[PDB]
DNA sequence: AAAAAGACTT
DNA sequence: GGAAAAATTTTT
DNA sequence: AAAAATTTTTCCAAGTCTTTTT
């Protein structure tokens, strides 16, 4: 049938839902233990570890393969955790994590994942038909008169946590989630779901102000996880139509507004000045606004009002270019921001002013924030907050770079290069630089290889029609005229080929660095893509895929070639 | 306000 | 949503 | 077949921003 949620009337400010029903949560697998052949060694004798400390030590021995489990805090970390899920008289003998061997648990495991890719198709087929039901009872919610897909249905199970970066918190055991630590979320005259047999929720509400089903609070960082609903549905669409359409309404006035901060770079108070040159940042150069996090919770990564004095240095002229400012600092994920940019006069100036009498350690942004920048932004424009600067600026640099990159003569797997590129462009200036994958990027001599064998392929196609011209010399007839037709027709398709490889090709190299993926689902508006298909005749499922295209399903409907951004 | 929370992005 | 796995696929 | 390159689910957090409580 197919609900086209986007056709009907918005829906009304406050509520998100009238009615909810779900099965609720799915739990993480049980611990199955460890055979009577598997032992851990602690000091070089045998130990048979109680159930929940044997459920911490596989966790360790599973990524003892990786370079992690030998940092400091990891292990410290670690061991605290573990010297807790420890019985009494464990307790006693385990004083260290230094003298326990997790050799044999960790091969056995190693055996196992080996021992799974030898699985027969019988039973590969068993799994993946009792996965699938699994997919059709919990998979899916009601939410108002329509059956809408669930997000992550199944809930996280326990390990060790790393984060990313330099996380005071890596190592530390995430601790399995019981029935009795779900906050269920439904209607009244809805079927409330039953927890596992002889458990109980902790809190069963029914809140219409919130989007979630269910929710839980994780021993890490005390942050409230939940279970949302996919993003085919329409409260997660109708949203990120609104993103877009924020963006727009920027548009229309992002120029008065370029053109405001610009002359508050000369203005009297110290307040209103600092609050400029950060709006700059964050339109002209890319940079997330950055939120105050506690320390030695969290990793210490910064954004632009988080900045601090030993991130940013100074240069006056810097191979040829009068002002440069060279930014070195670790971003969101701990992403590395290296850029050395050639400002205004008014801005070199004004970073001066901001550095004066101050240490590396202390904030270049004083007197100013994440909630003193956005106040400004709502009295500049209704809605406006420092993250529709990432989603305008991606936006319309997507839509200039492809007025620019498609050539109305070029063929469709051509078209598709062009597109690539554009978004490439997109992703080197939000910042979504990438490490080149380990060994991997070596194949690119095996893809060279299949480029260098279709040239072995023309080099007999263009001698194939020099003997289709050598042989029209004696004897000219419709027989001889056909072969000059043949073997013409022949060296195109061939050439179509190596172009189209030579396309594909060209895409891997540049695109080595870079991550096209959070650009396009989450900056880029899909109608500047549909508009583009639509427009060139290059269908649709050759840019997105079969999740996005159920994501941007709104847009690749509702949205025509002249759709303009 | 000004932390501390809770809800959605990316 | 990127990085690692797993369910598929193309080269061997 | 059986090693190997490409493709799609399943692991894992870290931000931005609004809404409460203190
Ligand atoms: O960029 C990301 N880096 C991440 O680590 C990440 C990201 C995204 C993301 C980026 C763009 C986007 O459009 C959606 C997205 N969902 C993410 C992550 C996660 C992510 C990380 C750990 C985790 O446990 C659940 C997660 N979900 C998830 O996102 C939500 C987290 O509450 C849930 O819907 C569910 O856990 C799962 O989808």
Not at 279 to 308: M, P, Q
Request: proline share 4%; hydrophobic share 35%; charged share 35%.
């Amino acid at each position: 049938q197919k609900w086209k949620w986007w056709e009907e009337e918005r829906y009304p400010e406050g509520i998100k839902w009238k009615f909810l029903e779900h099965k609720g949560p799915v739990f993480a697998p049980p611990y199955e233990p460890l055979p009577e052949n598997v032992k851990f060694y602690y000091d070089g004798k045998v130990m048979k570890l109680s159930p929940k400390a044997e459920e911490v030590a596989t966790f360790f021995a599973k990524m003892l393969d990786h370079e992690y489990t030998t940092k400091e805090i990891f292990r410290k970390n670690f061991f605290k955790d573990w010297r807790k899920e420890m019985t009494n008289e464990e307790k006693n003998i385990i004083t260290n994590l230094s003298k326990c061997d997790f050799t044999q648990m960790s091969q056995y495991f190693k055996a196992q994942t080996e021992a799974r890719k030898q699985m027969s198709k019988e039973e590969k087929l068993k799994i993946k038909e009792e996965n699938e039901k699994l997919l059709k009872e919990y998979g899916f919610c009601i939410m108002d008169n329509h059956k809408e897909r669930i997000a992550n249905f199944k809930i996280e199970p326990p390990g060790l946590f790393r984060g990313r970066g330099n996380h005071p918190k890596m190592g530390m055991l995430k601790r399995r989630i019981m029935p009795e630590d779900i906050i269920i979320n439904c209607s009244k005259d809805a079927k409330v779901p039953s927890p596992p047999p002889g458990h109980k929720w902790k809190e069963v509400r029914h809140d219409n102000k919130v989007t979630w089903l269910v929710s839980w609070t994780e021993n890490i960082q005390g942050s409230i996880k939940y279970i949302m609903l996919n993003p085919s549905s329409r409260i997660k669409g109708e949203k990120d139509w609104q993103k877009y359409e924020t963006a727009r309404r920027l548009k229309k006035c992002v120029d008065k507004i370029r053109n405001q901060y610009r002359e508050d770079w000369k203005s009297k108070e110290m307040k209103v000045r600092q609050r400029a040159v950060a709006l700059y940042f964050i339109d002209k150069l890319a940079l997330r606004a950055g939120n105050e996090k506690e320390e030695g919770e969290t990793a210490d990564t910064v954004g632009c009002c988080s900045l601090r004095v030993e991130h940013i240095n100074l240069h006056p002229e810097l191979d040829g270019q009068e002002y440069v400012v060279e930014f070195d600092f670790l971003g969101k994920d701990s992403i590395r921001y290296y850029n050395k940019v050639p400002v205004e006069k008014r801005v070199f100036k004004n970073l001066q002013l901001f550095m004066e009498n101050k240490q590396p350690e202390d904030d270049l942004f004083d007197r100013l924030n994440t909630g003193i920048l956005n106040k400004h932004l709502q009295d500049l424009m209704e809605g406006l907050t420092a993250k529709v600067f990432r989603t305008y600026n991606a936006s319309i640099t997507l839509q200039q770079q492809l007025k620019e990159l498609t050539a109305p003569d070029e063929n469709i797997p051509a078209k598709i290069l062009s597109y690539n590129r554009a978004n490439r462009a997109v992703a080197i200036l939000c910042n979504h630089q990438r490490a080149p994958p380990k060994t991997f990027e070596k194949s690119m001599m095996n893809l060279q290889t299949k480029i260098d064998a279709k040239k072995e392929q023309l080099a007999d196609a263009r001698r194939d029609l020099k003997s289709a011209k050598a042989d029209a010399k004696v004897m000219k007839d419709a027989k001889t005229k056909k072969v000059v037709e043949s073997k013409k027709k022949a060296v195109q398709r061939l050439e179509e080929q190596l172009m189209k490889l030579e396309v594909q090709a060209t895409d891997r190299e540049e695109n080595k660095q870079i991550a096209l993926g959070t650009s396009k689902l989450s900056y880029l508006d899909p109608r500047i893509t549909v508009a583009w298909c639509k427009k060139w005749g290059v269908p649709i499922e050759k840019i997105y895929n079969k999740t996005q295209r159920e994501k941007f399903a709104w847009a690749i409907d509702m949205a025509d070639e002249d759709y303009e951004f």
